[PDB]
Design a binder for this molecule. Structure first.
Ligand SMILES: [Mg+2]
Ligand SMILES: [Mg+2]
Ligand SMILES: [Mg+2]
Ligand SMILES: [Mg+2]
Ligand SMILES: [Mg+2]
Lengths: 204, 233, 226, 222, 196, 125, 212, 195, 196, 195
């Protein structure tokens, strides 16, 4: 019935020293029924990364939409979009559907190519921006993620330390949520290299 | 299950160094109609306890009779009824708290919020709350209804924790209570200017003040306020 | 949310807490609730957070275009009229509750706006879940002819009453002072009475703690030459 | 319509050690967006080296604790001052709760103490009396924020030994009373930051063979 | 809310309380419910604040544009514009408005516009939640062609009682006097009217 | 009524010239001189304030206009056409950019939007 | 929840998951869904956890009073009917119960009775109850034979819970195994689904869809 | 309609779909083919609300056939599935949404690979080795999880499919009157007339 | 319904209209709402006619049995019996009763018992649907220790206004005077009170 | 439960009852006997709400068995049916009624006649040559109306019963997993183990 918790799934993003990290589970379901263990919720447009939880049809639709818009942006601007700008685009795009919204919980993550500054942001389904320094959480285990992130997180973590923190935050949260899990992916993002790691976790 | 008909609004209270203060206005509303202007909602029990009651007035009158009946019953076969075996605030509260919870459990509640303020045999301050659900709690400041939202913030600026109680005098505590009553008169649409205030001190005993009025009100600034935006005249 | 506005001698001050919530969960512990409609017209919002942000950006945008068109500095009454007519049109469905304050050639102003489109004038105002806690403080300490320093004190004290006593409000106090014949000064995190204490333990994991299945380099760069 | 139930917020946490047990709970009591009391004790010493807390609707919580304390008293009368064992107390509580199966105590009950072999014990109950011995259990408002953290830091879930890469789990080494109290305090500090109903103060009751000891700690009051 | 408008010898006087409530909370204790649509045509507002403000602003626009073309409008004309808005949009409005104005030809006039959108020209009018409690008093005490001082006393005593019994009404008693002499604002505080 | 001119008033002549555009350029040629110079750390734009009368207040007539906080414009030709272009240029900087990206458009893109408006007046009915 | 029980040559296999959920929130991964009524009788819990715990524990007290009075082991038929008659009295009140009363006596042999809070009482050879029952049934139906060994039957019950654990979002945690013989039930351990899945995947070659 | 299954093997895609058409109290037909050929190497089976199912399937069919003529070229199964998803994703926020779930089984002639796409009425697309809609997965997935291998032959896939149908016939309350099975491979689409 | 009881120097007077409506139909235009529970203890009835009649009959029984044993009951005692019935059965009663009586020791006394079942001793009391419109008038015009003729005029003028505005009230104004002298019934017709 | 049929022929009564027991989504059993022997020459089949069906049937069984012992005499089918009707008629105005429909097939040893009684959960008794409960009659009665004769043999009755079951298996959406058939005659009650 509740659109934001039909398909299930989670996204978490964290900042570190000269780096950001964004991670997600791989589950897609029809309520109790597990349907897919390969449904990735993190996408990227140039160097800007976008996680999207919520209703899976909208996750797909919005990815296709932001690919569309960032591609036209790049052709006209003659440069790749930045995280701060993209965040505003995501906010605008969601709010234009104010009285018929996409049932999603987007999460932006990336590093500004000019300043080198790590950036993360989160949104509600209607476009309200949450620009936190520390971390952003989203999905059906957002409460669990808030609890994990609040205790495990410390500022200025190195890329390889940050990986451990965000991974353990995701995994242990997803294990306390029926509609999340079935695999997980973690992106470690630096100014000019990005490492993508699939995590091993319990398959139920 | 009922609905409250004739109702009484906020009851506010706080602890100070030697005892407790409690106050409540003299209004018995009938919905938006300010029907009864001479309703006493602070009811003393003996010389050491004052029970403040908000909510349904017919149920208040019933509770008032139970307490009157409690004093009579305590005096039966009790030579020390006015000494060692007199009614304590803690006895009176626990009795009411029992009744309130029993009644809610039969799905027929006494539609009230009650604050029992008093001083015990050993001089300790007693201040505790109970309502139609049988929910109970204690705190240096307690208030019902609108008082909870507006009075508590002001009273907590005086006594913010347990350690602030010995530092607070009766004059400071009474001043804070009287100010809170003024604030409630400004802002609670179901309040009146006339109120009662009771002080229970371990040295000077029970001091019951009737026919008090909210005074030193600020209204003059209203003359300058014109329209709702653009209007100048 | 706790937001307040206080008039003083030569201007007006607004203040707000910095807690934004999802039901009982604190989403952002240092949210910025003081928004800029124009350089010297600021407002604080409560209710639906996206609506307060969106409606101030829209009116702020139209106010800027209006200012350029008329070659005049924007007025608070213009922001007020544009906000209320927009909110009224949508019959409360845009859940924006605003305290609008500012200075302009006409003088200093303070208004409140409710989601259905009604507006009120006052010397001191409060909105949000902690408005009753804040209004108690304002009603207890407000007076006519406040100085700049007294108004900042009163405004921040009213926000504190909300921070401590209202569960919907917390963290820090933001303040913005708009004085006549001066630049408006935005005082981000004016007070910080809710710093978290050092934890009993460090939860930094040993490297290699997490089990990994695959690694790969992601191609963020464009299609390459040669 | 009259609603006999209410939510008084609060969060509690029971952890069973090797030869000890702790039952912690914040001291904040609330309705909706208002604070009733910054210090209203929620965890209680019920005698016979048993501690108890009934979190949720405070009136039913207080009623249940009162009735259980009363059950301990009458157990002594009827059975020659015999000590009520934690497992017996648990079964007795099930019957108290299930006794109101069709008008439940709207609470999540936890008790803690030592079993008959002297080892740490915690029992967890649902509102209608289904129960179980557990090593680790958070209850109440911020239970979802605390339990995943405990799975990770107490039971070492998802943690593996460096170098092996997912092949060897981190060994389940025993935690001391000092080590548990650190995790309890950090759980409540974290819960206070991210949950509006949690704060003011933390009260911990520690049960050992020597008896019941109390520890109090401040929490953020916003 | 307690509002009233009363015609007298020299013209008309509008009277109102200052309380605005959201449930049992007084959102504004110093509200100005007497609002100006033209130089000497004012109105008392009751019902939805958002609606009555929106209506009054539109009327003020219409009468401003009327004046630019055809000169000063009559009080009847102002009431007709109010009516037209309230009647045609009756499904989406909760507005009870009393229109009061002063011409030199017609002198003081009062028109009441209740929920439905109907118009009723009267010697005096009372409206708002608190009006119920003073129908008896006002009917017994009203006289035609009163003086300024008598009409101020009549309004003051009437709204005093309305405020006393109605929890929705309170604060200060605002008044606006409309005569050939001009426009005079009056204010009366709790300490003055409560002891009456 | 109705705008019954739904056809192009600018059309290709046999020689391949667009007459109305050429004639518009002729009007620009008659206009007062304005110029622009780009430096390493800035840009300057300038023009003469040709006062139609000495009684007129030439300060009120602004030939140089702010479009965004970091963009400015000056013209040569018909002043009224410029004035309405500045109004459209300011509005389009908000509607088609600032309200989407939360920032002001870069010079080249705002110029592109202005160019689009001028192109449409060259083809529309 | 996923619970199963089936009759075979060597008696009865009982297998259950261990997950308990309140909505999407996983309340527990270590829940006991086999009630040890007595040393000879087992009962599974599905639906209401309290209702199954309380009344089957109570059933054990009745079975004890029976064999004290009658000086003879209570039959599985009689034991199951005491429970079904009880819950039938409460029909309409809102009890939630889906259980298999399992036992092995002389006169009956291995017997399984499905008992329901609607009052249903069914004797059968294979039963699956819970949100993940359909997944467990598939593995059971395709692989079940009467002449299974105790070793293979135990594995089949374990593998069937695993099938449900994987697909059903409200099943998992760990697998509890029991083997019921005439001389009593024998507990065959707790098996974490997380570790069991990878073990089964590798050794069996199943779950090729999943990356490991 | 009721049950529709799909399984991608080594070199083909197999779609099984029930034959029953029920109307409240009566089974009106027991030989209904719940599928449409979108292009020579792409088949779409469907199940959902009456009327909407066929109306949607034929609308898609017409559009893919139009594209085939215009470009003189067959769209890839991936391309077709993306087109279908968009139509359903467009549909869900319409005045009256199409209540239709589909499986798209195709053979990509460019990549020489079989492909199975599962799309529900919300526009939720997933590429799978085996898939189902409604309650069909609840009975069958445990068998498919166990037995499935990516290098299965077409004959092995049909055997695993028979086991799935048998389990459905045993444990489902509804009589779906058996299934029509079709195979999609490099040579095109063909029906298994005996099953 | 419009009912009131007013204490004065010599005792107390009960006043009431005579209209009883079923919706907008006047079922009885000559109702007697002033009913006797004892020689010099009467009551005014408002709300459900079936309920107030059933209550009044029970009270009359209780006071009759009281008198047989303990002699004449006080007005307070009568009000307490009314209260006990109304409070204990509040879920199943729609009764608003004003109790008025005359002792020699206590003189004139008035007790009002609204819906809830609470008791309020007052100098005077007003109740029923029509009372709303005369709270202002009665509060302004009531004085303590009035004469018989003044109190009759006060009640007559009050109920006249209540009747004028309330459609639920009407018919004749009945009154009952309770003094040491005895019990006097009074009636006032439309032609008399309407022209006031 | 679902389908229960009854047919009175020349010298016996034949009761057919489905074997399926479905609980929501799954068919838990496919061999359930929805009948009880009340006395040596009286059989009662039943269908209705879960729990109530068996609870009622066994309660009746116990009462008839008690009467048989007390009087050392078997009650006539008519007498048994009247007793059963009264219990259901008593039940319908209870706090929680038995939701059970029954067919009572018996052979009267005094009159040497077979008798079939149909009684619904309201206590609506009718003596019939052939009867059913729920939707079973909708499919079967047209066949029974056509083919039935009062002088049919037991073998002819079974053939007509097979035709009824075949029509049910064709046009009913629900899979009732076939039927258990029992025959009541002068020699008592016996089950037709192959059908
Ligand atoms: Mg907090
Ligand atoms: Mg409206
Ligand atoms: Mg008032
Ligand atoms: Mg699972
Ligand atoms: Mg799908």
């Amino acid at each position: 019935s509740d659109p934001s918790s039909i398909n299930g799934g989670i996204v978490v993003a964290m900042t570190g020293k000269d780096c950001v990290a964004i991670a997600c589970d791989l589950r897609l379901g029809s309520q109790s029924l597990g349907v897919s263990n390969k449904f990735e919720k993190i996408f990227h447009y140039g160097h800007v990364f976008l996680g999207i939880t919520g209703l899976a049809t909208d996750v797909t639709t919005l990815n296709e939409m932001f690919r569309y818009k960032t591609n036209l942006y790049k052709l006209k601007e003659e440069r790749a979009i930045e995280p701060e700008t993209f965040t505003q685009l995501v906010s605008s795009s969601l709010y234009e559907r104010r009285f018929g919204p996409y049932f999603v919980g987007p999460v932006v993550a990336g590093i500004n190519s000019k300043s080198g500054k790590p950036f993360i942001a989160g949104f509600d389904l209607i476009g309200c921006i949450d620009e936190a320094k520390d971390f952003i959480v989203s999905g059906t285990a957002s409460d669990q993620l808030f609890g994990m992130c609040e205790s495990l997180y410390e500022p200025n973590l190195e890329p390889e330390d940050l990986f451990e923190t965000i991974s353990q935050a995701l995994l242990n949260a997803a294990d306390r949520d029926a509609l999340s899990g079935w695999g997980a992916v973690v992106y470690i993002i630096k100014k000019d290299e990005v490492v993508k790691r699939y995590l091993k976790m319990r398959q139920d | 299950t009922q609905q409250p008909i004739v109702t009484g609004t906020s009851v506010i209270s706080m602890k100070y160094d030697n005892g407790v203060i409690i106050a409540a206005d003299n209004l018995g509303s009938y919905g938006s109609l300010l029907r009864f202007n001479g309703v006493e909602r602070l009811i003393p029990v003996g010389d050491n306890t004052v029970v403040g009651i908000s909510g349904d007035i017919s149920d208040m009158q019933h509770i008032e009779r139970l307490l009157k009946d409690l004093v009579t019953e305590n005096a039966y076969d009790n030579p020390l009824a006015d000494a060692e075996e007199a009614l304590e605030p803690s006895y009176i509260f626990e009795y009411l708290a029992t009744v309130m919870y029993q009644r809610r459990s039969k799905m027929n509640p006494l539609w009230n919020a009650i604050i029992v303020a008093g001083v015990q045999s050993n001089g300790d301050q007693f201040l505790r709350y109970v309502n139609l659900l049988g929910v109970t709690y204690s705190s240096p400041t307690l208030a019902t209804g609108f008082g909870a939202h507006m009075a508590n913030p002001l009273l907590r600026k005086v006594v913010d924790r347990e350690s602030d109680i010995p530092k607070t005098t009766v004059q400071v505590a009474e001043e804070a209570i009287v100010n809170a009553m003024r604030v409630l008169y400004y802002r609670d649409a179901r309040s009146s200017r006339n109120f009662s205030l009771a002080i229970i001190d371990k040295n000077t005993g029970l001091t019951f003040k009737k026919n008090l009025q909210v005074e030193n009100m600020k209204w003059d600034f209203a003359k300058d306020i014109k329209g709702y935006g653009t209007q100048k005249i | 949310t706790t937001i307040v506005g206080v008039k003083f001698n030569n201007g007006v001050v607004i203040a707000a807490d910095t807690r934004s919530t999802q039901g009982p969960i604190v989403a952002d512990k240092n949210c910025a609730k003081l928004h800029r409609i124009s350089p010297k017209i600021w407002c604080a919002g409560a209710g639906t957070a996206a609506d307060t942000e969106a409606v101030t950006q829209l009116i702020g945008s139209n106010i800027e275009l209006h200012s350029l068109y008329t070659s005049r500095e924007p007025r608070v009454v213009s922001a007020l009229q544009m906000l209320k007519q927009h909110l009224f049109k949508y019959q409360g469905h845009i859940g924006a509750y605003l305290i609008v304050a500012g200075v302009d050639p006409t003088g200093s102003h303070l208004f409140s706006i409710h989601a259905h489109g009604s507006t009120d004038v006052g010397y001191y105002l409060s909105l949000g879940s902690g408005s009753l806690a804040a209004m108690a403080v304002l009603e207890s300490h407000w007076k006519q002819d406040l100085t700049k320093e007294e108004a900042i004190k009163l405004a921040s004290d009213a926000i504190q009453a909300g921070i401590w006593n209202d569960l919907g409000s917390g963290s820090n106090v933001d303040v913005c002072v708009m004085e006549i014949g001066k630049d408006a000064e935005y005082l981000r995190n004016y007070l910080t009475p809710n710093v978290r204490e050092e934890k009993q333990k460090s939860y930094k994991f040993p490297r290699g703690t997490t089990a990994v299945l695959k690694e790969s380099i992601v191609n963020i760069c464009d299609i390459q030459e040669e | 319509q009259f609603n006999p139930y209410g939510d008084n917020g609060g969060t509690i946490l029971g952890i069973a050690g090797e030869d000890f047990a702790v039952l912690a709970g914040d001291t904040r009591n609330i309705t909706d967006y208002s604070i009733n009391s910054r210090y209203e004790p929620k965890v209680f010493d019920c005698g016979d080296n048993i501690v108890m807390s009934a979190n949720g609707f405070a009136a039913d919580g207080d009623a249940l604790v009162k009735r259980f304390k009363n059950s301990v008293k009458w157990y002594h009368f009827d059975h020659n001052d015999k000590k009520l064992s934690i497992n017996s107390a648990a079964r007795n509580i099930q019957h108290l709760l299930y006794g109101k199966r069709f008008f439940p105590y709207y609470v999540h009950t936890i008790i803690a103490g030592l079993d008959e072999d002297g080892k740490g014990a915690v029992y967890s109950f649902d509102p209608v009396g289904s129960y179980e011995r557990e090593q680790c259990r958070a209850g109440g408002a911020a239970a979802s924020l605390i339990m995943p953290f405990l799975d990770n830091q107490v039971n070492f879930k998802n943690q593996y030994e460096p170098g092996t890469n997912g092949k060897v789990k981190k060994p389940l080494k025993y935690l001391s009373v000092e080590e548990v109290i650190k995790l309890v305090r950090d759980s409540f500090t974290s819960a206070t930051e991210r949950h509006i109903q949690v704060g003011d103060g933390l009260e911990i009751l520690i049960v050992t063979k020597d008896g019941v000891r109390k520890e109090f700690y401040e929490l953020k009051r916003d | 809310t307690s509002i009233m408008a009363v015609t007298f010898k020299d013209g008309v006087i509008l009277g109102a309380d200052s309380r605005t409530t959201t449930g049992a909370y007084i959102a504004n204790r110093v509200t100005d419910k007497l609002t100006r649509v033209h130089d000497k045509i004012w109105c008392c507002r009751s019902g939805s604040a958002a609606d009555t403000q929106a209506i009054a602003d539109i009327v003020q626009y219409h009468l401003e544009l009327y004046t630019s073309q055809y000169g000063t409008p009559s009080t009847e004309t102002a009431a007709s514009v109010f009516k037209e808005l309230c009647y045609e949009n009756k499904d989406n409005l909760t507005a009870g408005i009393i229109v009061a104005g002063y011409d030199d030809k017609n002198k003081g006039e009062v028109y009441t516009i209740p929920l439905g959108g109907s118009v009723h020209k009267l010697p005096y009018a009372i409206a708002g939640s608190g009006s119920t409690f003073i129908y008896g008093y006002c009917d017994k005490n009203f006289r035609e062609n009163m003086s300024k001082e008598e009409t101020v006393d009549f309004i003051k005593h009437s709204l005093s009682q309305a405020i006393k019994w109605d929890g929705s009404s309170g604060g200060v008693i605002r008044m606006v006097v409309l005569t050939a002499a001009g426009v005079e604002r009056l204010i009366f505080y709790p300490d003055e009217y409560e002891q009456l | 009524m109705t705008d019954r001119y739904s056809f192009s008033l600018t059309t290709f002549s046999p020689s391949g010239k667009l007459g109305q555009i050429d004639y518009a350029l002729t009007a620009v040629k008659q206009g007062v001189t304005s110029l622009g110079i780009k430096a390493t750390n800035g840009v300057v734009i300038a023009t003469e304030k040709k006062s139609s009368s000495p009684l007129a207040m030439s300060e009120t007539l602004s030939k140089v206009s702010l479009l965004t906080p970091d963009i400015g414009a000056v013209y040569s030709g018909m002043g009224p056409d410029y004035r309405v272009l500045v109004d459209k240029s300011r509005k389009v900087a908000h509607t088609s950019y600032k309200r989407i990206y939360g920032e002001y458009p870069p010079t080249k893109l705002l110029v592109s939007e202005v160019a689009k408006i001028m192109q449409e007046a060259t083809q529309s009915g | 929840t996923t619970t199963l029980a089936f009759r075979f040559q060597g008696g009865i296999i009982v297998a259950v998951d261990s997950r308990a959920t309140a909505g999407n929130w996983v309340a527990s991964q270590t829940v006991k869904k086999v009630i040890e009524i007595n040393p000879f009788l087992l009962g599974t819990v599905a639906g209401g956890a309290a209702d199954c715990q309380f009344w089957e524990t109570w059933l054990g007290s009745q079975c004890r009073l029976h064999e004290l009075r009658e000086k003879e082991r209570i039959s599985v038929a009689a034991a199951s009917k005491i429970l079904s008659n009880l819950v039938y009295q409460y029909k309409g009140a809102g009890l939630s119960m889906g259980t298999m009363i399992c036992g092995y006596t002389r006169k009956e042999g291995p017997t399984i009775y499905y008992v329901d809070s609607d009052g249903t009482r069914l004797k059968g050879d294979i039963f699956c109850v819970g949100s993940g029952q359909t997944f467990a049934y598939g593995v059971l139906d395709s692989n079940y034979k009467w002449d299974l060994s105790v070793e293979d039957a135990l594995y089949l019950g374990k593998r069937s819970i695993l099938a449900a654990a994987h697909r059903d979002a409200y099943s998992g945690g760990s697998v509890n195994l029991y083997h019921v013989t005439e001389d009593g039930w024998i507990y065959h351990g707790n098996h974490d689904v997380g570790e069991l899945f990878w073990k089964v995947k590798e050794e069996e070659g199943s779950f090729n869809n999943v990356i490991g | 309609m009721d049950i529709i299954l799909g399984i991608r093997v080594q070199d083909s895609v197999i779609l099984a779909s029930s034959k029953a058409v029920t109307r409240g109290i009566s089974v009106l037909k027991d030989s209904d083919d719940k599928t449409r050929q979108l292009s020579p190497h792409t088949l779409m089976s469907f199940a959902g609300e009456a009327g909407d199912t066929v109306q949607f399937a034929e609308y898609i069919q017409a559009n893919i056939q139009l594209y085939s003529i215009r470009e003189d070229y067959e769209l890839s199964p991936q391309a077709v599935s993306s087109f279908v998803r968009q139509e359903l994703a467009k549909s869900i926020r319409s005045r009256r949404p199409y209540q239709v779930n589909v499986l798209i089984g195709g053979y990509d002639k460019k990549k020489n690979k079989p492909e199975l796409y599962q799309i529900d009425y919300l526009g939720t697309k997933v590429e799978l080795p085996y898939g189902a809609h409604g309650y069909s997965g609840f009975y069958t997935f445990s068998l498919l999880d166990h037995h499935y291998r990516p290098d299965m032959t077409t004959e092995e896939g049909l055997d695993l499919l028979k086991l799935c149908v048998q389990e459905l016939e045993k444990r489902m309350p509804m009589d779906f009157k058996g299934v029509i099975v079709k195979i999609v491979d490099k040579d095109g689409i063909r029906q298994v007339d005996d099953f």
